[PDB]
Short mmCIF file of C-alpha atoms in Angstrom, two decimals:
data_model
loop_
_atom_site.label_atom_id
_atom_site.label_comp_id
_atom_site.label_asym_id
_atom_site.label_seq_id
_atom_site.Cartn_x
_atom_site.Cartn_y
_atom_site.Cartn_z
CA UNK A 790 1.48 -27.60 5.22
CA UNK A 791 4.54 -25.40 5.72
CA UNK A 792 5.67 -21.79 5.31
CA UNK A 793 8.35 -22.72 2.74
CA UNK A 794 9.72 -19.51 1.22
CA UNK A 795 10.51 -19.20 -2.51
CA UNK A 796 14.00 -17.86 -1.87
CA UNK A 797 17.55 -19.15 -2.05
CA UNK A 798 18.64 -16.47 0.44
CA UNK A 799 16.87 -13.95 2.65
CA UNK A 800 15.65 -11.46 0.05
CA UNK A 801 12.95 -8.84 -0.53
CA UNK A 802 9.72 -10.78 -0.02
CA UNK A 803 7.47 -10.65 -3.08
CA UNK A 804 4.45 -11.25 -0.84
CA UNK A 805 4.74 -7.74 0.63
CA UNK A 806 5.16 -5.49 -2.41
CA UNK A 807 2.74 -3.18 -4.12
CA UNK A 808 1.33 -4.11 -7.55
CA UNK A 809 3.27 -1.09 -8.91
CA UNK A 810 6.64 -2.42 -7.68
CA UNK A 811 9.07 -4.12 -10.08
CA UNK A 812 12.05 -6.29 -9.15
CA UNK A 813 15.17 -7.40 -11.02
CA UNK A 814 16.79 -10.44 -9.42
CA UNK A 815 19.97 -9.83 -11.43
CA UNK A 816 20.70 -7.46 -8.54
CA UNK A 817 17.32 -7.87 -6.78
CA UNK A 818 16.95 -4.16 -7.44
CA UNK A 819 13.54 -2.57 -7.01
CA UNK A 820 12.02 0.06 -9.30
CA UNK A 821 8.70 1.84 -9.84
CA UNK A 822 6.92 3.99 -12.39
CA UNK A 823 4.49 6.38 -10.67
CA UNK A 824 4.97 8.11 -7.33
CA UNK A 825 6.29 6.24 -4.31
CA UNK A 826 5.91 2.64 -3.18
CA UNK A 827 7.38 0.36 -0.54
CA UNK A 828 8.91 -3.12 -0.45
CA UNK A 829 10.30 -5.11 2.47
CA UNK A 830 12.71 -7.99 3.01
CA UNK A 831 11.82 -11.60 3.83
CA UNK A 832 13.03 -11.45 7.44
CA UNK A 833 11.97 -9.32 10.40
CA UNK A 834 13.81 -8.35 13.58
CA UNK A 835 12.33 -8.87 17.04
CA UNK A 836 15.40 -8.44 19.29
CA UNK A 837 19.14 -7.93 19.29
CA UNK A 838 21.33 -5.78 17.08
CA UNK A 839 21.82 -6.31 13.36
CA UNK A 840 22.89 -4.64 10.17
CA UNK A 841 22.45 -4.67 6.38
CA UNK A 842 23.08 -2.38 3.42
CA UNK A 843 21.43 -0.73 0.44
CA UNK A 844 23.31 -0.30 -2.84
CA UNK A 845 22.03 2.44 -5.17
CA UNK A 846 22.48 1.82 -8.89
CA UNK A 847 20.54 4.76 -10.40
CA UNK A 848 19.52 8.15 -8.99
CA UNK A 849 18.45 10.73 -11.59
CA UNK A 850 17.26 14.11 -10.23
CA UNK A 851 13.59 13.09 -10.49
CA UNK A 852 14.58 9.83 -8.78
CA UNK A 853 14.66 9.83 -4.97
CA UNK A 854 14.60 6.51 -3.16
CA UNK A 855 14.10 6.23 0.59
CA UNK A 856 15.67 3.54 2.73
CA UNK A 857 15.04 2.44 6.29
CA UNK A 858 12.95 0.29 8.61
CA UNK A 859 9.22 -0.22 9.02
CA UNK A 860 7.00 -2.22 11.35
CA UNK A 861 3.94 -4.09 10.08
CA UNK A 862 0.88 -1.82 9.62
CA UNK A 863 3.14 -0.11 7.07
CA UNK A 864 1.11 0.59 3.95
CA UNK A 865 3.43 -0.54 1.15
CA UNK A 866 2.04 2.14 -1.18
CA UNK A 867 3.24 4.94 1.16
CA UNK A 868 6.79 6.35 0.97
CA UNK A 869 8.36 4.56 3.94
CA UNK A 870 7.93 7.11 6.69
CA UNK A 871 4.50 8.54 6.02
CA UNK A 872 3.26 6.79 9.20
CA UNK A 873 4.65 6.64 12.74
CA UNK A 874 5.70 3.00 12.32
CA UNK A 875 8.36 3.70 9.68
CA UNK A 876 11.71 5.48 9.89
CA UNK A 877 13.75 6.02 6.74
CA UNK A 878 16.23 8.29 4.97
CA UNK A 879 15.58 10.34 1.85
CA UNK A 880 18.19 9.72 -0.85
CA UNK A 881 18.54 13.28 -2.10
CA UNK A 882 20.20 14.78 0.96
CA UNK A 883 20.63 12.59 4.01
CA UNK A 884 17.41 13.45 5.82
CA UNK A 885 15.64 11.27 8.36
CA UNK A 886 11.96 10.88 7.48
CA UNK A 887 9.39 9.68 10.01
CA UNK A 888 5.71 10.56 10.41
CA UNK A 889 6.24 12.21 7.00
CA UNK A 890 8.42 14.70 8.92
CA UNK A 891 11.87 15.41 7.53
CA UNK A 892 14.76 16.10 9.90
CA UNK A 893 18.24 17.25 8.93
CA UNK A 894 19.85 15.54 11.95
CA UNK A 895 21.89 13.58 9.43
CA UNK A 896 24.79 13.61 6.98
CA UNK A 897 24.77 14.05 3.20
CA UNK A 898 23.82 11.38 0.67
CA UNK A 899 25.64 10.54 -2.55
CA UNK A 900 24.36 9.18 -5.85
CA UNK A 901 26.58 6.09 -5.70
CA UNK A 902 26.26 5.45 -1.99
CA UNK A 903 26.64 1.93 -0.61
CA UNK A 904 24.86 2.71 2.65
CA UNK A 905 25.15 0.59 5.78
CA UNK A 906 22.22 0.29 8.18
CA UNK A 907 22.74 -0.71 11.82
CA UNK A 908 19.85 -1.17 14.24
CA UNK A 909 19.60 -2.49 17.80
CA UNK A 910 16.31 -3.40 19.46
CA UNK A 911 16.22 -4.76 23.03
CA UNK A 912 15.41 -8.35 23.89
CA UNK A 913 11.74 -9.31 23.89
CA UNK A 914 11.81 -8.77 27.66
CA UNK A 915 12.16 -4.99 27.44
CA UNK A 916 10.01 -5.13 24.29
CA UNK A 917 6.98 -6.78 25.93
CA UNK A 918 7.73 -7.26 29.66
CA UNK A 919 5.19 -10.07 29.29
CA UNK A 920 4.42 -13.15 27.19
CA UNK A 921 5.77 -12.89 23.61
CA UNK A 922 3.50 -15.74 22.52
CA UNK A 923 3.24 -16.32 18.78
CA UNK A 924 -0.01 -18.21 18.26
CA UNK A 925 -0.21 -18.19 14.47
CA UNK A 926 -3.11 -18.20 12.03
CA UNK A 927 -2.97 -20.54 9.05
CA UNK A 928 -5.52 -20.75 6.24
CA UNK A 929 -5.21 -22.80 3.06
CA UNK A 930 -6.25 -21.31 -0.27
CA UNK A 931 -5.87 -22.45 -3.86
CA UNK A 932 -5.43 -19.30 -5.93
CA UNK A 933 -5.85 -19.46 -9.72
CA UNK A 934 -3.17 -22.13 -10.24
CA UNK A 935 -1.21 -22.47 -6.98
CA UNK A 936 -1.66 -23.12 -3.26
CA UNK A 937 -1.01 -20.38 -0.70
CA UNK A 938 -1.51 -19.59 2.98
CA UNK A 939 -3.33 -16.69 4.61
CA UNK A 940 -2.63 -15.35 8.10
CA UNK A 941 -4.08 -12.50 10.14
CA UNK A 942 -1.85 -9.44 10.43
CA UNK A 943 -1.88 -6.69 13.04
CA UNK A 944 -4.36 -3.80 13.04
CA UNK A 945 -3.72 -0.06 12.71
CA UNK A 946 -2.50 1.05 16.13
CA UNK A 947 -3.89 4.28 17.59
CA UNK A 948 -0.82 4.52 19.83
CA UNK A 949 -0.17 8.17 20.66
CA UNK A 950 1.87 7.66 23.86
CA UNK A 951 5.66 7.48 23.63
CA UNK A 952 7.16 4.38 25.25
CA UNK A 953 10.47 3.86 23.47
CA UNK A 954 11.92 0.37 23.47
CA UNK A 955 14.73 0.56 26.06
CA UNK A 956 18.23 1.19 24.70
CA UNK A 957 17.09 0.66 21.10
CA UNK A 958 18.68 2.79 18.39
CA UNK A 959 19.39 3.14 14.67
CA UNK A 960 22.74 4.13 13.16
CA UNK A 961 23.43 5.09 9.54
CA UNK A 962 26.74 4.60 7.73
CA UNK A 963 27.98 5.81 4.35
CA UNK A 964 30.24 3.03 3.06
CA UNK A 965 30.87 2.04 6.68
CA UNK A 966 31.74 5.61 7.68
CA UNK A 967 29.36 6.58 10.47
CA UNK A 968 26.69 8.92 9.15
CA UNK A 969 25.40 8.97 12.72
CA UNK A 970 22.40 8.07 14.83
CA UNK A 971 19.06 8.35 13.03
CA UNK A 972 16.37 7.43 15.59
CA UNK A 973 16.83 6.64 19.27
CA UNK A 974 13.09 6.61 20.00
CA UNK A 975 11.90 3.26 18.65
CA UNK A 976 8.36 2.01 19.24
CA UNK A 977 7.55 -1.59 20.08
CA UNK A 978 6.60 -4.19 17.50
CA UNK A 979 8.75 -6.10 15.05
CA UNK A 980 10.51 -4.12 12.32
CA UNK A 981 11.82 -5.06 8.90
CA UNK A 982 14.16 -3.33 6.43
CA UNK A 983 12.23 -1.50 3.74
CA UNK A 984 12.80 0.48 0.55
CA UNK A 985 10.57 3.17 -0.94
CA UNK A 986 10.72 4.03 -4.62
CA UNK A 987 9.95 7.31 -6.29
CA UNK A 988 9.56 7.45 -10.08
CA UNK A 989 12.15 5.00 -11.49
CA UNK A 990 14.50 4.51 -8.53
CA UNK A 991 17.03 1.65 -8.63
CA UNK A 992 18.24 0.36 -5.25
CA UNK A 993 18.83 -3.05 -3.67
CA UNK A 994 19.20 -4.56 -0.20
CA UNK A 995 22.20 -6.69 0.68
CA UNK A 996 23.30 -9.04 3.47
CA UNK A 997 26.57 -9.42 5.34
CA UNK A 998 28.82 -12.23 4.00
CA UNK A 999 29.40 -10.28 0.75
CA UNK A 1000 29.83 -6.95 2.46
CA UNK A 1001 32.13 -4.06 1.53
CA UNK A 1002 32.62 -2.06 4.79
CA UNK A 1003 31.28 -4.30 7.56
CA UNK A 1004 31.46 -3.57 11.28
CA UNK A 1005 33.62 -6.03 13.19
CA UNK A 1006 31.12 -6.46 16.02
CA UNK A 1007 30.66 -10.01 17.30
CA UNK A 1008 27.03 -9.42 18.34
CA UNK A 1009 25.39 -7.88 15.27
CA UNK A 1010 23.92 -10.30 12.75
CA UNK A 1011 23.70 -10.06 8.93
CA UNK A 1012 20.43 -10.22 7.02
CA UNK A 1013 20.82 -13.92 6.20
CA UNK A 1014 21.37 -14.97 9.82
CA UNK A 1015 18.22 -13.37 11.23
CA UNK A 1016 16.49 -14.58 8.07
CA UNK A 1017 17.09 -18.27 8.67
CA UNK A 1018 16.47 -17.64 12.37
CA UNK A 1019 12.96 -16.37 11.66
CA UNK A 1020 12.44 -19.14 9.08
CA UNK A 1021 13.28 -21.83 11.65
CA UNK A 1022 11.13 -20.00 14.21
CA UNK A 1023 8.10 -20.11 11.91
CA UNK A 1024 8.84 -23.78 11.20
CA UNK A 1025 8.54 -24.39 14.94
CA UNK A 1026 5.39 -22.26 14.91
CA UNK A 1027 3.82 -24.63 12.38
CA UNK A 1028 5.09 -27.54 14.50
CA UNK A 1029 3.48 -26.19 17.66
CA UNK A 1030 0.16 -25.29 16.03
CA UNK A 1031 -0.19 -28.74 14.47
CA UNK A 1032 0.76 -30.17 17.87
CA UNK A 1033 -1.93 -28.10 19.64
CA UNK A 1034 -4.69 -29.10 17.24
CA UNK A 1035 -3.45 -32.68 16.76
CA UNK A 1036 -2.14 -33.90 20.14
CA UNK A 1037 -3.25 -32.98 23.65
CA UNK A 1038 -0.68 -31.13 25.72
CA UNK A 1039 2.13 -28.60 25.39
CA UNK A 1040 5.33 -27.91 27.31
CA UNK A 1041 8.31 -25.53 27.00
CA UNK A 1042 11.60 -25.24 28.91
CA UNK A 1043 12.67 -22.68 31.57
CA UNK A 1044 11.23 -19.61 30.00
CA UNK A 1045 14.19 -17.24 29.75
CA UNK A 1046 15.24 -18.11 26.19
CA UNK B 1414 -17.78 -6.14 -29.95
CA UNK B 1415 -14.34 -5.59 -28.43
CA UNK B 1416 -14.23 -3.54 -25.26
CA UNK B 1417 -11.52 -1.40 -26.94
CA UNK B 1418 -13.64 -0.96 -30.07
CA UNK B 1419 -16.75 -0.33 -27.97
CA UNK B 1420 -14.79 2.17 -25.88
CA UNK B 1421 -13.55 3.99 -28.97
CA UNK B 1422 -17.12 4.13 -30.25
CA UNK B 1423 -18.30 5.42 -26.86
CA UNK B 1424 -15.65 8.15 -26.72
CA UNK B 1425 -16.61 9.12 -30.28
CA UNK B 1426 -20.36 9.33 -29.64
CA UNK B 1427 -20.37 10.63 -26.06
CA UNK B 1428 -20.31 14.32 -26.99
CA UNK B 1429 -23.49 14.04 -29.09
CA UNK B 1430 -25.30 11.26 -27.21
CA UNK B 1431 -25.88 13.01 -23.87
CA UNK B 1432 -26.39 16.55 -22.60
CA UNK B 1433 -26.63 18.52 -19.37
CA UNK B 1434 -29.70 20.58 -18.55
CA UNK B 1435 -31.66 21.99 -15.66
CA UNK B 1436 -32.86 18.99 -13.68
CA UNK B 1437 -36.02 18.54 -11.60
CA UNK B 1438 -33.98 16.09 -9.52
CA UNK B 1439 -31.50 18.77 -8.44
CA UNK B 1440 -29.84 21.70 -10.21
CA UNK B 1441 -28.21 20.52 -13.44
CA UNK B 1442 -27.94 16.92 -14.58
CA UNK B 1443 -27.31 14.53 -17.43
CA UNK B 1444 -30.15 13.98 -19.91
CA UNK B 1445 -30.36 11.60 -22.84
CA UNK B 1446 -30.30 13.15 -26.31
CA UNK B 1447 -30.53 9.96 -28.41
CA UNK B 1448 -32.29 6.71 -27.53
CA UNK B 1449 -29.73 4.55 -25.69
CA UNK B 1450 -30.09 0.78 -25.77
CA UNK B 1451 -29.67 -1.45 -22.73
CA UNK B 1452 -26.17 -2.45 -21.64
CA UNK B 1453 -24.50 -0.12 -24.13
CA UNK B 1454 -21.83 2.38 -23.15
CA UNK B 1455 -23.48 5.59 -21.95
CA UNK B 1456 -20.51 7.60 -20.71
CA UNK B 1457 -17.07 7.35 -19.14
CA UNK B 1458 -16.56 9.11 -15.82
CA UNK B 1459 -13.27 10.38 -17.19
CA UNK B 1460 -10.85 12.24 -14.95
CA UNK B 1461 -7.54 12.03 -13.12
CA UNK B 1462 -6.53 8.43 -12.47
CA UNK B 1463 -4.76 8.35 -9.10
CA UNK B 1464 -3.80 5.80 -6.48
CA UNK B 1465 -5.94 5.37 -3.38
CA UNK B 1466 -3.28 6.48 -0.88
CA UNK B 1467 -3.31 9.95 -2.49
CA UNK B 1468 -7.08 10.41 -2.13
CA UNK B 1469 -7.08 11.90 1.37
CA UNK B 1470 -4.20 14.29 0.65
CA UNK B 1471 -6.26 15.52 -2.30
CA UNK B 1472 -9.54 15.52 -0.35
CA UNK B 1473 -8.17 17.54 2.56
CA UNK B 1474 -6.59 19.77 -0.10
CA UNK B 1475 -10.04 20.40 -1.57
CA UNK B 1476 -11.28 20.65 2.01
CA UNK B 1477 -8.77 23.48 2.40
CA UNK B 1478 -10.01 25.08 -0.84
CA UNK B 1479 -13.75 24.67 -0.35
CA UNK B 1480 -13.97 22.78 -3.65
CA UNK B 1481 -16.20 19.72 -3.74
CA UNK B 1482 -14.62 16.31 -4.20
CA UNK B 1483 -15.43 14.56 -7.49
CA UNK B 1484 -13.89 11.13 -6.88
CA UNK B 1485 -15.05 7.64 -7.78
CA UNK B 1486 -13.34 4.51 -6.49
CA UNK B 1487 -12.04 2.50 -9.42
CA UNK B 1488 -10.98 -0.25 -7.01
CA UNK B 1489 -9.08 -0.71 -3.75
CA UNK B 1490 -6.01 0.80 -5.46
CA UNK B 1491 -7.16 3.43 -7.97
CA UNK B 1492 -9.61 6.32 -8.10
CA UNK B 1493 -10.81 8.64 -10.85
CA UNK B 1494 -10.75 12.11 -9.28
CA UNK B 1495 -12.70 14.53 -11.48
CA UNK B 1496 -12.74 17.49 -9.06
CA UNK B 1497 -10.28 19.60 -11.07
CA UNK B 1498 -10.24 17.70 -14.37
CA UNK B 1499 -13.20 15.71 -15.61
CA UNK B 1500 -15.99 15.39 -18.14
CA UNK B 1501 -19.78 15.71 -18.29
CA UNK B 1502 -20.18 12.52 -16.23
CA UNK B 1503 -19.79 14.78 -13.18
CA UNK B 1504 -23.47 15.69 -13.70
CA UNK B 1505 -25.13 12.26 -13.43
CA UNK B 1506 -27.70 12.36 -10.65
CA UNK B 1507 -28.69 9.23 -8.71
CA UNK B 1508 -31.98 7.35 -8.64
CA UNK B 1509 -33.05 4.41 -6.52
CA UNK B 1510 -34.42 3.07 -9.82
CA UNK B 1511 -31.45 3.54 -12.17
CA UNK B 1512 -31.61 2.95 -15.89
CA UNK B 1513 -27.80 2.89 -15.74
CA UNK B 1514 -25.03 1.11 -13.88
CA UNK B 1515 -21.31 1.68 -13.36
CA UNK B 1516 -18.75 -0.91 -14.44
CA UNK B 1517 -14.96 -0.92 -14.54
CA UNK B 1518 -13.37 -2.06 -17.80
CA UNK B 1519 -9.73 -2.78 -18.64
CA UNK B 1520 -8.50 -1.22 -21.89
CA UNK B 1521 -4.84 -1.84 -22.76
CA UNK B 1522 -4.10 -2.22 -19.04
CA UNK B 1523 -5.81 0.95 -17.77
CA UNK B 1524 -9.13 0.87 -15.95
CA UNK B 1525 -12.08 2.98 -17.10
CA UNK B 1526 -15.27 3.53 -15.11
CA UNK B 1527 -18.07 3.48 -17.70
CA UNK B 1528 -21.72 4.07 -16.90
CA UNK B 1529 -23.68 1.69 -19.14
CA UNK B 1530 -27.45 1.61 -19.57
CA UNK B 1531 -29.38 -0.76 -17.31
CA UNK B 1532 -32.21 -0.58 -19.86
CA UNK B 1533 -33.18 0.93 -23.20
CA UNK B 1534 -32.96 4.64 -22.44
CA UNK B 1535 -34.88 7.04 -24.67
CA UNK B 1536 -34.24 10.63 -25.68
CA UNK B 1537 -34.85 13.31 -23.06
CA UNK B 1538 -34.48 10.95 -20.10
CA UNK B 1539 -32.25 12.09 -17.27
CA UNK B 1540 -29.39 9.68 -16.67
CA UNK B 1541 -29.06 8.25 -13.16
CA UNK B 1542 -27.22 5.32 -11.59
CA UNK B 1543 -26.71 3.70 -8.20
CA UNK B 1544 -23.94 5.54 -6.39
CA UNK B 1545 -24.09 2.81 -3.72
CA UNK B 1546 -23.06 5.29 -1.06
CA UNK B 1547 -22.52 3.62 2.34
CA UNK B 1548 -24.97 4.37 5.13
CA UNK B 1549 -23.88 7.48 7.01
CA UNK B 1550 -25.45 8.95 10.16
CA UNK B 1551 -27.96 11.59 6.01
CA UNK B 1552 -28.56 12.95 2.51
CA UNK B 1553 -32.26 13.12 1.53
CA UNK B 1554 -33.02 11.87 -1.97
CA UNK B 1555 -35.43 13.42 -4.47
CA UNK B 1556 -35.02 10.90 -7.29
CA UNK B 1557 -38.80 10.54 -7.58
CA UNK B 1558 -38.74 6.74 -7.63
CA UNK B 1559 -41.48 4.88 -5.79
CA UNK B 1560 -38.82 2.57 -4.29
CA UNK B 1561 -36.66 5.53 -3.19
CA UNK B 1562 -34.77 4.81 0.04
CA UNK B 1563 -35.45 8.46 1.04
CA UNK B 1564 -31.68 8.59 1.58
CA UNK B 1565 -28.61 7.62 -0.42
CA UNK B 1566 -27.23 6.40 2.90
#
């Protein structure tokens, strides 16, 4: 087996879209027909600082996309911010949306905005302060005409206590120009970049090597870099699980990395 | 016969096939006005086709308005909400021994919840199906069936 991903680059994963969510790989744009929906990228951040963009190609008045981040447990039919595990921006006026609450602690949005998205989560130390073990589930299925793998995802968290990940933040840019900080309070758990569609919204996510107004930081990582990082990590996850079940013993170096 | 053709025939004959009258089951309910054969289309539970995520926002809304919820789960993703906009199918009582049964059909891509007849239903009979309501902690039933669970739940 293996978790081989049907993607030439780190893109919006088709496995985590709603059945009412359409894609066009000419620009990998995403569109819908009725109400709101949510799609996510292939990768997912667990530590460090990183950055991506969204390019908007169509925004009629009855068309309002929302763009941001969301942890798993995020119902991909909801408009990216209806729960406490998602933090986005509404693309009518720059308005930060989280817990379905709109906040005007933000700049203004434009119809042809190439918006940059910077986000820094602490290392898994300050994220967990404990073991970040990744014992994975793997189940083989043969759907109608093709083979696929099932894994167990996380459960709806009843977390009502605020324990922000230390020194984590989110910054929003309009064409590189700092639109400002969006959310400093960031809950634990991995996050991934996500896009919510209203009726017929056309937007697309984009990585770093083809950027327009990139930050010159030496620490932040584009979408593709964290993408292949997570891909290699899950490769090693398959390696270690097949090791566990197949050969007696396991062993890992001095824990820190 | 084609599910589209059968569905067109059902929507043509529904207005004259069934009626609503005072019911000994409870209040007003759906009665048969012309002998209905087994497995044939009795009635669509027509209404507002919505997504599942919008159910609660509607429900609480009705909960704020004191208006009863008329919603049936199409599937894990869609629901026909007939609270504000519906048809006569909102008056089908339940019986532990139903002569009818609900099934979801796909016509031209859209799903329709049609109550069909579990058996040959004759004129005058009150129409009832299995709501299959999950076991709560209790609605007494007065369907009159000898197998009656005494409770929908």
